[PDB]
């Protein structure tokens, strides 16, 4: 479920 391609930077 957690997407590896999601934003990996500070929100």
């Amino acid at each position: 479920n957690p997407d590896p391609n999601a934003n990996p930077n500070v929100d």
Partner: antibody, heavy 123, light 107 residues
Framework: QVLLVESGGGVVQPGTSLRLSCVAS????????MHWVRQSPGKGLEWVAI????????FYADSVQGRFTVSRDNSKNTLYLQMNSLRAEDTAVYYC????????????????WGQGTTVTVSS | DIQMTQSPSTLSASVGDRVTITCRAS??????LAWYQQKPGKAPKLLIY???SLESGVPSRFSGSGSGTEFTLTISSLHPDDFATYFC????????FGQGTKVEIKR
């Protein structure tokens, strides 16, 4: 401006351990996700791992799960790859790469790569 | 996973030629595709991001297009600095790469 420098590569026998390091300068390393990618002559480019800006989420390629551990020390601006149980197929040039800048996108690639450090596994 | 099929494997072209490299994703990847240039002994350099956006400092003769499964990188007028290997990369489901296209000098 933006600079990544990989280090720690060398010639090692199979089964041993080896830790690679990537030192970042010229940007706010602590706020960016980071990647390892490797390239071998008979397998092209292959993504290895990603670590979130804060060190929480880490994902790994199926081939290295259990054997490789990615980590970072934001206080030192350094990315780490701990390689264990090294196999001949781990012979490659290893690159570190910065995640792409934040935007409205929901998917993220890479924007800047380091020079690479060569790992050769042989008896 | 998602496989990227890049073609041709090698291409010999004269300076000033029109050069097009294609990549095909095994399933739809929307526009989540990047193009890289690599010269021997150096790291890949990002040229095009999100299928069609030129990166900083990349000359105007480069362009990229595509959405879904078929993508292309075109160099309208091949420059002496452009002979190199090019790679695509999808970034919608992990990160996977094409096999590479070597663009070689015709003589």
């Amino acid at each position: 401006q933006v600079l990544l420098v990989e280090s720690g590569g060398g010639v090692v026998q199979p089964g041993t351990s080896l830790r690679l390091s990537c030192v970042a300068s010229g940007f706010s390393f602590s706020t960016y996700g980071m990647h390892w990618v490797r390239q071998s002559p008979g397998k092209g480019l292959e993504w290895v791992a990603i670590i979130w800006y804060d060190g929480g989420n880490k994902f790994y390629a199926d081939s290295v799960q259990g054997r490789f551990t990615v980590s970072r020390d934001n206080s030192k601006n350094t990315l780490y790859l701990q390689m264990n149980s090294l196999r001949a197929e781990d012979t490659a040039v290893y690159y570190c790469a910065k995640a792409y800048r934040t935007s409205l996108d929901k998917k993220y690639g890479m924007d800047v790569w380091g020079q690479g450090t060569t790992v050769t596994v042989s008896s | 996973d998602i496989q990227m099929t890049q073609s041709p494997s090698t291409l010999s072209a004269s300076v000033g030629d029109r050069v097009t490299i294609t990549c095909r994703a095994s399933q739809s990847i929307a526009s989540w595709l990047a193009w890289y240039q690599q010269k021997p002994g150096k790291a890949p350099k990002l040229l095009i991001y999100k299928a069609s956006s030129l990166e900083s400092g990349v000359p105007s003769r480069f362009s990229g297009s595509g959405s879904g499964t078929e993508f292309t990188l075109t160099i309208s007028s091949l420059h002496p600095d452009d002979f190199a290997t090019y790679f695509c990369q999808q970034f919608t489901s992990y990160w996977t790469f094409g096999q590479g296209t070597k663009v070689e000098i015709k003589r």
